[PDB]
Amino acid sequence: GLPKNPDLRIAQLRFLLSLPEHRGDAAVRDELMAAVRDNNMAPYYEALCKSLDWQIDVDLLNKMKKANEDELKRLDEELEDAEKNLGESEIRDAMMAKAEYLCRIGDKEGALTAFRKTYDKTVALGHRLDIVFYLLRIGLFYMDNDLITRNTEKAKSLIEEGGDWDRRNRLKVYQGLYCVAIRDFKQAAELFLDTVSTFTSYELMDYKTFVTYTVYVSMIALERPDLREKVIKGAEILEVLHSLPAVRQYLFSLYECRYSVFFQSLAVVEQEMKKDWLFAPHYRYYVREMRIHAYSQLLESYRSLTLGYMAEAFGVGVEFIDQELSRFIAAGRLHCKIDKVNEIVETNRPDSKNWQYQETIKKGDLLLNRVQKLSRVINM
Amino acid sequence: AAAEHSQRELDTVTLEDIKEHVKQLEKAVSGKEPRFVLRALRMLPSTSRRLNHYVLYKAVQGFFTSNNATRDFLLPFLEEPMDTEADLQFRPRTGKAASTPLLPEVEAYLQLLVVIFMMNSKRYKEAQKISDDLMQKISTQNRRALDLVAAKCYYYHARVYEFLDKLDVVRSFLHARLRTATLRHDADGQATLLNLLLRNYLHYSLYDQAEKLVSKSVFPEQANNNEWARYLYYTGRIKAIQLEYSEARRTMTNALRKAPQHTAVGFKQTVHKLLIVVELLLGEIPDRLQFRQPSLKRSLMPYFLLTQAVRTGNLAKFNQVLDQFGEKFQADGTYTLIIRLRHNVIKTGVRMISLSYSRISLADIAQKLQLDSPEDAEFIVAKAIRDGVIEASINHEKGYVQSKEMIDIYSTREPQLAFHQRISFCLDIHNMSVKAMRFPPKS
Amino acid sequence: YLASLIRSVVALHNLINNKIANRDAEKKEG
Amino acid sequence: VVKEMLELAKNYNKAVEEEDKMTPEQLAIKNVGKQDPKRHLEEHVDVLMTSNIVQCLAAM
Amino acid sequence: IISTHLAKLYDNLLEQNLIRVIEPFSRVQIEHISSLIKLSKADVERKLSQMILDKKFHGILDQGEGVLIIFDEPPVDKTYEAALETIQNMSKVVDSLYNKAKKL
Amino acid sequence: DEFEEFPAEEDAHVWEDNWDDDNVEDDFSNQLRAELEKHGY
């Protein structure tokens, strides 16, 4: 539906070229180079060269820049012609069309300003959203944090006044994609799992990748009861899971309790997470997280399990399984205490009364602090 | 200039604020409630700023002006405005009111404002002469309300001396002046004086001298939140140095909790500085949400590299940080405490091992804590066990550090005792709320 | 304890409501 | 009783958090039906706390 | 169609039979339950693990003694749940008291 | 009531960060690759 301006594929490719091991990748360069020449991205090239120390093609740039100039002039000529002869509908589209060319050419700042001017004059609520959505994509493409949050606030407010379902469905993914990059995974699970059945924003990502993200984020977020009813038995998620078997093995292996393949399947999910432009800063926090759930899930049933069994069940040595439990137990993530002399791990899961009482002290203590904090004030 | 015209409007409003203060100040004197003054004194910091030479002159030409020597004392000490066009005679005292000597509350309040202006004007000596005379005035003055206004001036007077950078001349004065309050059962004045006194003590590192003063003295329980927060930090600083770590955390965390939500970017900065270092020496890795906060982000970043060192236990990294960021610690007054840590990094890892492992064989403890020999850990393993950083028993018969078998607490008496301290405070809050309830004498 | 807390928050709320009451009447007298 | 008092706190939050100021003195008199604010409040606290204290003291 | 559905059966026939066997015992060697069900200890080792995990029957599998500790789940003691919800309730009211305090 | 007595003495990342994240260690796939290879042989 919406335009592919800006192409998030370009952003993902550039981040991949930024990564050390892939900095020398040639296939990425062709695809990144292919996108620039096809859409005539002159300014982005400059930004691309300066960041990655690439060599600028003067002939391409001059022809591109002249093409950009003549194209920009043509839009400028069209804008002037519309102003003298046409009404606000034609100037509105002309200004709206003008910015879209800034998007295609990589001019971050110029695109933001041109669009902002259009939103000032745009009247129809339907057109207002499209420009708002347009800024959001710019933010994600450049990872411009403040822009993505501000427009998101605009989108929510604009939609609430008058919002058709089609745009609200789209915003749900747009809110979600940001959430993955701010490491707010739980909200990404709610946002995506409510639009997996009706994913209509093909601009951001292909459908196979949207479900692939959903399985990645769903597992870290949902508890086993919710994961079963909303992902494993989910109609749409499984269907595209027949074309991405590796993610299928990853999702099921945790649910079916095949931990040997889950850890091995996690190695792929850790490497893949390193290359995505969105899951890059969060890959380490992710592989750690699913690791804790894997351990805690197995220990949920066994009270005291031999560390020899855990190493065999996880297909990892006795030493490594002892180590990770040690590092995780300390941070208060796993409820267990490793007995190294006998190599036996005993679980310390609080009784229902204990946890409720503990919660009364904590939740109660926070409240009494406030009452004391307030009590002093008013009593003077 | 319109800026000063709003300023005099600010002056008159501050005069009206002062007149509000003075009218409330004169209200409390005849209102039979010292509480009223506290409102004027809390606006004091707010009205403390927003004043130039014309302000006090018209105030002192508006207030006082009884031909009393008072005018002769502060008028020369502050620049007098010219024949301003807007000569709004702001005289809350008219004739007889002018004839009547200013109540010790307003005079000090006006004089303090001059004192504040003296501070605001860096005139700590004219304020010194102003202030000590203020004290020389209020030293004799024995009212019940002036103790409040005296208390505020004291810290400013301590503050005027604070900018005077002596702090020993007022060491005795604040030390004796304190005793005047305690022999009066006065509440606020004793609180304010003690905090300024203690600041004096730590400023020269007489922790021994300071540790005594808190030992015999009793801080009024019904004290200002602002003060209660201060005393807790100074006691925390003293306790931490005295090697009473566990109590240092409890007071400092409690001192931090009492910080005036968001006004004092500084106090929260320093306390967190000690809390992070205090916590490390006790074997607890401090909260991470601290180091990311806006106000304390760069301020505590110097301590950040430290707490990362302790958890990593990479002594080479720990020394490297002291070499670089260490010098900055001295100004914060923490270098010494960090030096304790350098030969105490082993404790936490002993705690980390006791928190996760439950029967770790000693030889294994040596491997996971970098201890040179299995024998060396034994003293350290026991010592951490001995010092109550662990809850384990070392069965030397076979070299395994057993951890204590944790019990179902809800079936033991711990939860009841925790509820008692809670209920007693909850009931007390009801009494304190009900006890005051300040039903105004039915008009 | 839960009974004690409810009686305390109600107590404070009653003082805050009362502190407003006499203060508001205090200003309103002028 | 704790369940019944809980629902009475929900109203207490709504009744207070409303704090509607459209003549609040009149609000406190147009909503008097022996309801949430206090009467069905700590009235239960006294019953709940009296029953436990007496029972506990008898127990010890 | 015969595999997915039938497999679900045997995977269910095992549960209904595991429960019948464990009904009497209160602690039974994972080795013994294998003999009754006629399944390898590994097969019952797992199926027990998933049944406990999924909240099928209230028990726990201790591996160091090779025993499944059957037991009874005590209720969630509603009283504490009404208190915890109430604490948050009163936590919100104490907030609205703040706002009344701001008016001074 | 600013405590002027005590003087009031890039990384704009939104997500709250936990201690274990700072830990410096080789990627997980390299651990498993080593762990699997070591027990694999």
| φ, ψ (nearest 5 deg) of residue B175 | -75, -40
Separation between Cα atoms, residue B35 and residue B145, nearest integer Å: 9
- Burial call B192-224: b when 16+ CB within 10 Å, e when fewer: bbbbbbbbbbbeeeebeebbebbeeeeebeebb
Sequential DSSP letters for A246-260: HHHHHHHHHHHT-HH
Amino acid residing at B332: D
Separation between Cα atoms, residue B429 and residue A371, nearest integer Å: 8
Tracing tokens 């959903």 back to the chain, one arrives at A214
Nearest to C16 among E86, E90, E100 (CB): E100
How far the first Cα of chain D sits from its last, in Å, is 23
Strand order in the sheet with A337-339: A304-306, A344-346, A337-339
Measured between CB atoms, does C13 come within 8 Å of chain D?
A: yes
Measured between CB atoms, does D48 come within 8 Å of chain C?
A: yes
| Residue of B53, B62, B52 lying closest to B21 (CA atoms) | B62
Amino acid residing at B50: R
CB pair distance less than 8 Å for A378 and C8: no
Token pair belonging to A166: 């089609």
The DSSP element (H or E) to which A275 belongs, if any, is helix A259-275
Residues, chain B, total? 443
| Residue of A274, A97, A289 lying closest to A185 (CA atoms) | A289
Tracing tokens 């997996």 back to the chain, one arrives at A196
Nearest CA of chain F to the CA of A159: how many Å?
A: 25
Cis peptide before A6 (omega within 30 of 0): yes
Whether the Cβ atoms of residue B210 and residue B198 lie closer than 8 Å to each other = yes
- Helical spans, DSSP H, in B205-314: 207-216, 225-241, 245-257, 265-282, 288-292, 294-312
Q: Which residue of E has its CA nearest to C9?
A: E94
| φ, ψ (nearest 5 deg) of residue B32 | 60, 25
Could you tell me which residues come within 8 angstroms of residue A359 by beta carbon, excluding any fewer than 6 positions away? E84
User: Alpha-carbon Rg of chain E, whole angstroms?
Assistant: 24
CA F34 from centre of chain: 22
| Residue of B400, B348, B388 lying closest to B369 (CA atoms) | B348
Token pair belonging to B268: 């929260």
Separation between Cα atoms, residue B393 and residue B395, nearest integer Å: 6
Separation between Cα atoms, residue B145 and residue B151, nearest integer Å: 10
Separation between Cα atoms, residue B188 and residue B205, nearest integer Å: 26
Whether the Cβ atoms of residue E95 and residue E88 lie closer than 8 Å to each other = no
Which of chain C's residues have a Cβ under 8 Å away from the Cβ of E87? Answer: 2, 5
Q: Which residue of E has its CA nearest to D1?
A: E79
List of chains touching B (3+ CB pairs within 8 A): A, C, F
Separation between Cα atoms, residue A54 and residue D28, nearest integer Å: 74
Nearest CA of chain A to the CA of F10: how many Å?
A: 13
Q: Bridge-partner residues for E68, per DSSP?
A: E28, E61
Q: Which residue of D has its CA nearest to C1?
A: D49
Whether the Cβ atoms of residue B138 and residue B107 lie closer than 8 Å to each other = no
How far the first Cα of chain A sits from its last, in Å, is 62
Helix pair angle (B294-312, B345-356), 10° resolution: 80
Q: Taking the alpha carbons of B72, B73, B74, B77 in that order, is the dihedral positive or negative?
A: positive
Separation between Cα atoms, residue B266 and residue B229, nearest integer Å: 13
Separation between Cα atoms, residue A219 and residue A291, nearest integer Å: 11
CA distances from A274 to A16, A86, A206, A271, B440 (A): 9, 51, 19, 5, 69
Strand order in the sheet with E67-68: E28-29, E67-68, E61-62
Do chains B and A touch, with touching meaning 3 or more CB–CB pairs less than 8 Å apart? yes
Q: D37: burial class by Cβ within 10 Å (0-12, 13-18, 19+)?
A: middle
Interface of A with E in 233-272 (CB under 8 A): 257
Phi-psi domain of A223 (left: phi exceeds 0; alpha: psi -120 through 50; beta: other) = beta
Separation between Cα atoms, residue B398 and residue B103, nearest integer Å: 80
Measured between CB atoms, does E53 come within 8 Å of chain A?
A: yes
Nearest to F32 among A263, A274, A285 (CB): A263
Tracing tokens 């693990």 back to the chain, one arrives at E49
DSSP assignment letter at A349: P
Separation between Cα atoms, residue B223 and residue B178, nearest integer Å: 15
List of chains touching A (3+ CB pairs within 8 A): B, C, E, F
Sequential DSSP letters for A181-223: HTT-HHHHHHHHHTTSTT---TTTS-HHHHHHHHHHHHHHHS-
Do chains D and F touch, with touching meaning 3 or more CB–CB pairs less than 8 Å apart? no
Q: A132: burial class by Cβ within 10 Å (0-12, 13-18, 19+)?
A: buried
| φ, ψ (nearest 5 deg) of residue A233 | -95, 5
Whether the Cβ atoms of residue B77 and residue B114 lie closer than 8 Å to each other = yes
Separation between Cα atoms, residue D16 and residue D3, nearest integer Å: 20
Separation between Cα atoms, residue E30 and residue A165, nearest integer Å: 55
CA distances from A69 to A59, A79, A375 (A): 14, 14, 68
Tracing tokens 């996760």 back to the chain, one arrives at B356
Separation between Cα atoms, residue A314 and residue A324, nearest integer Å: 12
Neighbour tally for B420: CB within 10 Å: 11
Do chains C and D touch, with touching meaning 3 or more CB–CB pairs less than 8 Å apart? yes
DSSP assignment letter at B320: H
Neighbour tally for B115: CB within 10 Å: 29
Whether the Cβ atoms of residue E63 and residue E44 lie closer than 8 Å to each other = no
CA distances from B119 to A169, B57, B170, B173 (A): 62, 16, 16, 19
Neighbour tally for D22: CB within 10 Å: 7
Which of chain E's residues have a Cβ under 8 Å away from the Cβ of C20? Answer: 100, 103-104
DSSP assignment letter at B88: -
User: Alpha-carbon Rg of chain B, whole angstroms?
Assistant: 28
Token pair belonging to A238: 């499984």
| φ, ψ (nearest 5 deg) of residue B155 | -65, -45
| Residue of B75, B192, B71, B74 lying closest to B131 (CA atoms) | B74
Interface of B with F in 155-174 (CB under 8 A): 155, 159, 162
Separation between Cα atoms, residue B142 and residue B151, nearest integer Å: 13
Amino acid residing at B74: L
DSSP assignment letter at A338: E
Q: Bridge-partner residues for B249, per DSSP?
A: none
Q: E4: burial class by Cβ within 10 Å (0-12, 13-18, 19+)?
A: exposed
Nearest to B433 among C5, C12, C25 (CB): C12
Separation between Cα atoms, residue F9 and residue B295, nearest integer Å: 10
- Burial call A303-331: b when 16+ CB within 10 Å, e when fewer: bbbbbebbbbbbbbbbebbbebbbbbbbb
Count of pairs with CB atoms under 8 A, one residue in B, one in C: 43
DSSP assignment letter at A56: P
| Residue of E95, D43, B436, B224 lying closest to A371 (CA atoms) | E95
Separation between Cα atoms, residue B390 and residue B283, nearest integer Å: 10
Separation between Cα atoms, residue B323 and residue F30, nearest integer Å: 35
Phi-psi domain of E67 (left: phi exceeds 0; alpha: psi -120 through 50; beta: other) = beta
Interface of B with C in 404-443 (CB under 8 A): 419, 422-423, 426-427, 429-430, 433-434, 436-440, 443
Separation between Cα atoms, residue A205 and residue A172, nearest integer Å: 14
Whether the Cβ atoms of residue B101 and residue B68 lie closer than 8 Å to each other = yes
Tracing tokens 């301020």 back to the chain, one arrives at B299
| φ, ψ (nearest 5 deg) of residue A143 | 60, 30
Nearest CA of chain B to the CA of A309: how many Å?
A: 18
Cis peptide before A3 (omega within 30 of 0): no
| φ, ψ (nearest 5 deg) of residue E67 | -135, 150
CB pair distance less than 8 Å for E48 and A301: yes
SS3 A372: helix
- Burial call E44-56: b when 16+ CB within 10 Å, e when fewer: bbbbbbebbbeee
Resolution of the solved structure (Å): 3.5
Token pair belonging to B231: 């005393």
DSSP assignment letter at E26: S
Which of chain A's residues have a Cβ under 8 Å away from the Cβ of B228? Answer: 376
CA distances from B306 to A349, B246, B270, B387, D57 (A): 33, 20, 16, 23, 53
Token pair belonging to B98: 């002018």
SS3 A17: helix
Residues, chain E, total? 104
CB pair distance less than 8 Å for B263 and F16: no
Q: How many domains does chain F have?
A: 1
Token pair belonging to E29: 């060697």
Whether the Cβ atoms of residue A112 and residue A147 lie closer than 8 Å to each other = yes
CB pair distance less than 8 Å for A270 and F27: yes
Pairing mode, if any, of strands E61-62 and E67-68? antiparallel
Separation between Cα atoms, residue B58 and residue B15, nearest integer Å: 9
Structural domain of residue F11, as residue ranges? 1-39
Token pair belonging to D32: 């008097």
Nearest CA of chain E to the CA of C9: how many Å?
A: 7
- Burial call A199-226: b when 16+ CB within 10 Å, e when fewer: bebebbbeeeebbbbbbbbbbbbbebee
Which of chain E's residues have a Cβ under 8 Å away from the Cβ of D19? Answer: 96, 99-100
Whether the Cβ atoms of residue A111 and residue A139 lie closer than 8 Å to each other = no
Whether the Cβ atoms of residue A188 and residue A159 lie closer than 8 Å to each other = no
Angle, CA of A111, A117 and A120, to the nearest 5°? 140
Measured between CB atoms, does E93 come within 8 Å of chain A?
A: no
SS3 A304: strand
